[PDB]
Design a protein around this nucleic acid. Structure first.
Ligand SMILES: [Fe+2]
Ligand SMILES: [O-]
Ligand SMILES: [Zn+2]
Length: 349
RNA sequence: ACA
């Protein structure tokens, strides 16, 4: 029994073209797509006003296709899980920093998170690395003065994700830019013949944040995009795969993984516990996280009986199943934070 | 389409 998982590189607002090429895969091969994974640059602009938050050169200031799906004029045929890249409607993703559906069958994993589906544990890391913004907190509500910084990966995601491989392994991990140094772990001489600009960066190419997470979690697969080219490498037990952008080949590949059981999209229990136990660092809605707290220290308070109480309370107020919510993203920001605060306060710690 |  096999599940077929589609992995997609940069979309850049060409959703109808992506789904057309996914639909033709099913009709030409006869295989069924379980769900779709996207590595970022989604450009989930609801309407014209969201163009302010799209940090791209002037020639790429385009609405794209997402608004057709947001308005219900188009319907995504497959469940699509994605992270954020550097070309995003960054205000939308900040409202959904704890993850959420931007529209039917399109689920944003948030700034970072782990999810469950078909017996798999999938980790996502949004954004691209810039050293001068890795210590910067998020300010809320989103402001046009932060269009240049909202998509930069923060350092604190390392401490948020480092313990996720204690109970069981991670099957798939998602990042937009490559883990730093991974370029040297494949056929880099061939990559340089096709992308001569990558050679000057050497082993420093990519994100050091994603390098640390890869070495810590060591998932079965690490999938990245951003660089608009095909690449594959092996970092110990981890299969690295990079994908191009929609409109060109090597933008979509397919993982054929064993299917232990078919299961709906669910929150990862270990991630849910991390989310609740770090609430004090995120309790100030106007600026988070407050790194006067130590994320590691907050997470060191996890116990077996506390984790059991959190899942019981999470299932009560939110539920283990990740279900579609059509409230406006500012309402979902407040709603999800309301129940994280409520669960934490009922733990009495 | 890093900036
Ligand atoms: Fe990108
Ligand atoms: O990209
Ligand atoms: Zn791209």
């Amino acid at each position: 029994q096999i599940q077929h998982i589609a992995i997609v590189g940069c979309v850049h607002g060409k959703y109808r073209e992506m789904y057309r090429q996914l639909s033709e895969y099913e009709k030409s091969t006869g295989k069924e797509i379980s769900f779709v994974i996207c590595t970022g640059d989604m450009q989930t602009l609801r309407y014209e006003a969201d163009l302010v938050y799209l940090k791209v050169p002037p020639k790429y200031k385009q609405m794209g296709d997402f608004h057709l799906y947001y308005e219900g004029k188009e319907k995504a045929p497959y469940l699509t899980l994605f992270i954020g890249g550097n070309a995003e409607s960054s205000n939308v993703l900040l409202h959904l920093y704890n993850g959420g559906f931007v529209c039917f069958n399109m689920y944003y994993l948030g700034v970072c998170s782990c999810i469950n589906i078909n017996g798999l544990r999938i980790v996502g890391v949004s954004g691209i690395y810039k050293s001068f913004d890795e210590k910067k907190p998020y300010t809320y509500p989103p402001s046009p003065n932060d269009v240049v910084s909202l998509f930069h990966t923060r350092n604190y995601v390392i401490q948020m994700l480092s313990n996720l491989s204690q109970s069981s392994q991670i099957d798939i991990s998602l990042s937009h830019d490559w883990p730093q140094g991974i370029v040297m772990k494949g056929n880099y001489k061939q990559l340089y013949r096709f992308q001569p600009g990558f050679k000057k960066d050497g082993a420093s190419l990519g994100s050091p944040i994603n390098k640390v997470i890869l070495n810590t979690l060591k998932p079965k697969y690490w999938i990245s995009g951003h660089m608009h080219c095909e690449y594959h490498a092996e970092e110990g037990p981890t299969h690295f795969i990079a994908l191009g952008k929609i409109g060109y080949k090597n933008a979509i590949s397919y993982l054929d993984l064993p299917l232990k059981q078919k299961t709906d999209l669910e929150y990862d229990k270990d991630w849910v516990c991390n989310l609740i136990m770090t609430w004090p660092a995120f309790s100030n809605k106007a600026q988070f996280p407050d790194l006067s707290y130590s994320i590691s220290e907050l997470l060191s308070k996890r116990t077996k009986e506390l984790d059991k109480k959190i899942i019981e309370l999470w299932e009560k107020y939110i539920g283990l199943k990740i279900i579609y919510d059509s409230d406006t993203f500012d309402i979902q920001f407040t709603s999800r934070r309301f129940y994280i605060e409520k669960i934490y306060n009922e733990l009495n710690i």
